[PDB]
Each structure stands twice: as structure tokens, then as C-alpha cells.
Amino acid sequence: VAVYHGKISRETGEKLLLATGLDGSYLLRDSESVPGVYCLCVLYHGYIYTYRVSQTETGSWSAETAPGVHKRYFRKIKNLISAFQKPDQGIVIPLQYPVEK
Amino acid sequence: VAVYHGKISRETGEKLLLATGLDGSYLLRDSESVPGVYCLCVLYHGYIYTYRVSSAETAPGVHKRYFRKIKNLISAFQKPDQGIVIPLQYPVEK
Amino acid sequence: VAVYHGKISRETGEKLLLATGLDGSYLLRDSESVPGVYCLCVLYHGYIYTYRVSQTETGSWSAETAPGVHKRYFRKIKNLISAFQKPDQGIVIPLQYPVEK
Amino acid sequence: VAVYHGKISRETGEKLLLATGLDGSYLLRDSESVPGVYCLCVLYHGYIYTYRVSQTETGSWSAETAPGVHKRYFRKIKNLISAFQKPDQGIVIPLQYPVEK
């Protein structure tokens, strides 16, 4: 996943996204608060929105958005990312500009 | 809930916890990412750990507990082995 | 100051000191009675002894101790704390075991 | 120097930088070739760039950069690292994202 950057902190990922200044800039990183979980981080109007991404026991991927709403599950994280490029998936703005480096 | 601080930002919350300088200091604040969700924020070894409360989202493999009252959730997380990095120890109330 | 723990109440700071069970354990906390003043709190024989610590208009620091004790002023609070690790300074026992976290 | 990681190998250092996937990610490690010399290691477009950093006869620090570059010397290694956060210092990309842990 070119947008996944392991071994970077929340602060680094936010500085990078903020530098882009583009709505829908995004990256994936490791959660610092919960080992084993990931954070899908999205810039919108100068603020970073962070959504927890995790795998089920059998390996399916989902993002936590509104509480208590049925999630969509994906075999592959790239398919999760693709789905969240569309509107009304539950994040503040669609994923549009991947931070790959 | 005495440790709940509404309206304040993540940065304000983190500064408050860092001002305590104690492992296990904690507060509750509003999520900036998901409206209507809260964040249970805990200081440990100089780092803030944030757990969404919305029940608390903790380490996978932990039996999720549910509480009628947030004050009873807070009390439960004052004990070990609840899925957060260190038990809740010192409330930041004001 | 590593022994300074802001934004915690008297009750919380005293419970923490008592948990250590060590004579000469100490911390510095915010006064809840007078904004801007601090409380140097020392455990001795199961009780907490509290001494007000404040900074003057000139930046100097001093502690209110036993009466009849010559009041000492310090440029820096860290130097006040070090001074009170020595014997015969007007507190119940010298500062010995800093509560730092 | 928070980006300094002693007692780690070239291999460990490079694996860690590559994992970040961010241009300008950097760390300082021990040279395995020359005891007491260091290596400033920087990720850029998928490649690790390694610049030797050493202290002189009389205690100043410098990095070996591109030929032709006017070599700067530093009393403090943190000031060396700050200078190399700017462009046109002789390395392939400025230092941007410190690997601190």
C-alpha cells in the first residue's frame, strides 16, 4: 500500500498532511494508542480527521466512522481505500490525494 | 463526569495531561474526528493514549464491556487488564 | 521541575504520596486555595505535611516553614527543592524520594 | 539527539527508514566501518543515502557531503542536524522527518 507509512508517529503524519494543504489528502499509519490497529488520516479544511482501521479475526478490513453504524468489510486494504474514494461512506471528505512519499 | 472537558481541543487535552507529569493521568474530551464520540485520554511515559468512547474501543482480543453510565466505565478502567496501556489513576477535573 | 504535578487536586496528590508509604516522599502541586502558589507536600510517618511555595515579583522563590526559621530565597525553584533535601531547613523531614511520575 | 540510535546495525537502520516510506526520513547510527564515526542516513525515493558524520581533532562535527560543497563544521551535533534541514547543504534532500523511536 503506497499510502501506508509504518514506523511514523501521529505528529509526523499530521505535519505531512498539513503541508499538502489539500482536502482529501490522506495516509495510513500505525496507531500509537492501540498496537495492531491502523489510522486512516485525512485532511479537510486544515484539520486532520483520524479513523481507526482494523482487521477482523478472519482478516477483513474495516474503518470505524459513525458509532453503531454497520461497517463495510474488505478483503484487501486497497479495496477499502478505493471504496472510501466515493462520497457518503462515513468519513468527512472522500480520499483523493494519496501521500506516498 | 468530573474529568469530562467538553469543547476543548485535542491539543488542549494533551497539554493538560502533560502538565500533570503523572503516569495514569486522564481526562475525557470530545472527538474532533467523529461528532458525538468522546476520547478517553491517558498519559503514560510522556505519551498520550487516546481511546474512543462512543463503551471504549481498546486492544483487540479484549472482551468489550458496556456501561450504562460513563462514570462506571471510568471506574472499571481504574483496574488492570482492561485493554488500555495503564490503569486510570489521576483524574484531571479542572 | 520533575516533582511538579500540575492540574491535580490536593486529594489526588495526597493519595499518591500516601501510596508510596515512604518517609520523605514529596511532590509539588498547585495550591487550590491561592492561584499562583504551590504546595510542597512531604510524607512523614503516615501523614502529609504541606508547605506553601511561592515566587515573588522579582522571580525569587521561597517556602513558608516552621516559625523562627530564617526564610531563604532562591533564584530558581529547582535550587529551593535541592536546598530542602538538606537537614535543618524548617520542614518535618528533608525531601528524599521525589515523586516524578 | 533524539534521532541517534546507537548499537543498531546498518541493516536495522535501513529497514526502519524504508518502512517509513517518506522522503527526508532520517536517523543517525554508529558507523560499523569506522568506530566512533556516525552515519546520517536519509531516505529519498526509495533509496538510503548515508553520509558519514565525524568529530575532529578538536571536537567539531561535520558531514561528508557532495564534492565541491563547502564543508561546514559544528560544535554541536544538534546544530549540524538543524543546518541539514535546509536545502543546498550538499545532501540529496533536506532532513525532514526524524526517526526518534
Q: What is the DSSP string of chain A?
A: -TTEETT--HHHHHHHHHHH--TTEEEEEE-SSSTT-EEEEEEETTEEEEEEEEE-TT--EEE--STTSPPP-BSSHHHHHHHTTSSSSSSSS---EE---
With contact defined as beta carbons under 8 Å apart, do B35 and B29 qualify? no
Residues 6+ apart with CB under 8 A from A85: A94, A95, A96
Which three three-digit cell numbers place residue A36? 495492531
Distances (CA, A) of D84 to A24, D15, D59, D79: 31, 22, 19, 9
Q: Is the dihedral of CA B10, B11, B12, B17 positive or negative?
A: positive
The amino acid that residue C6 corresponds to is: G
**Class of residue B4 by CB neighbours under 10 A (exposed 0-12, middle 13-18, buried 19+):** middle
Which three three-digit cell numbers place residue B35? 461528532
* B12 phi/psi in degrees, rounded to 5: -65, -45
User: Is residue B35 classed as helix, strand or coil in its secondary structure?
Assistant: coil
Angle at A42 between CA A56 and CA A9, to 5 degrees: 75
Which three three-digit cell numbers place residue A28? 495510513
Q: Which long-range contacts (CB under 8 A, 24 or more apart) does A84-92 make?
A: A84/A40, A89/A65, A90/A63, A90/A65, A90/A66, A91/A40, A91/A42, A91/A49, A91/A51, A91/A63, A91/A65, A92/A42, A92/A44, A92/A49, A92/B33
> Which chains does A contact via 3+ CB–CB distances below 8 A?
B, D
Query: Looking at the complex, does the CB of residue B46 fall below 8 Å from at least one CB of chain A?
Result: no
Distance, CA of B58 to CA of B77 (rounded, Å): 11
With contact defined as beta carbons under 8 Å apart, do B50 and B29 qualify? no
Instruction: Give residue numbers after which chain B breaks (C–N above 2.5 Å).
Output: 54
HEC readout, chain D: CCCEECCCCHHHHHHHHHHHCCCCEEEEEECCCCCCCEEEEEEECCEEEEEEEEECCCCCEEECCCCCCCCCCECCHHHHHHHCCCCCCCCCCCCCEECCC
Query: Looking at the complex, does the CB of residue A54 fall below 8 Å from at least one CB of chain B?
Result: yes
**B26 interaction partners in chain A (CB closer than 8 Å):** none
* C49 phi/psi in degrees, rounded to 5: -110, 130
With contact defined as beta carbons under 8 Å apart, do B59 and B83 qualify? yes
Q: How was this structure determined?
A: X-ray
Core vs surface per residue D76-100: b (16+ CB within 10 A) or e:
ebeebbeebeeeebbbebbbbbbbe
Distance, CA of B58 to CA of A34 (rounded, Å): 7
With contact defined as beta carbons under 8 Å apart, do B64 and B75 qualify? no
**A37 interaction partners in chain B (CB closer than 8 Å):** 60
> Touch between chain C and chain D (3+ CB pairs, < 8 Å)?
no
Number of H helices, E strands in chain C: 2, 6
Distance, CA of B30 to CA of B13 (rounded, Å): 10
With contact defined as beta carbons under 8 Å apart, do D29 and D8 qualify? yes
Distances (CA, A) of C9 to A24, B10, B14, C46: 43, 22, 18, 19
Resolution in A: 1.4
**Closest CA relative to residue C38, chosen from B18, B19, B25, B16:** B19
With contact defined as beta carbons under 8 Å apart, do D32 and D23 qualify? no
* Domains of chain A, earliest start first: 1-101 (3.30.505.10)
**Cross-strand bridge partners of residue D75:** none
Query: Is A66 close to B33, i.e. CB distance below 8 A?
Result: no
Distance, CA of D50 to CA of D65 (rounded, Å): 9
* C19 phi/psi in degrees, rounded to 5: -65, -30
User: Is residue C73 classed as helix, strand or coil in its secondary structure?
Assistant: coil
User: How many Cβ atoms are within 10 Å of A8's Cβ, its own excluded?
Assistant: 22
Element (H, E) at C19: helix C10-20
With contact defined as beta carbons under 8 Å apart, do B15 and B29 qualify? no
Distance, CA of D77 to CA of B55 (rounded, Å): 48
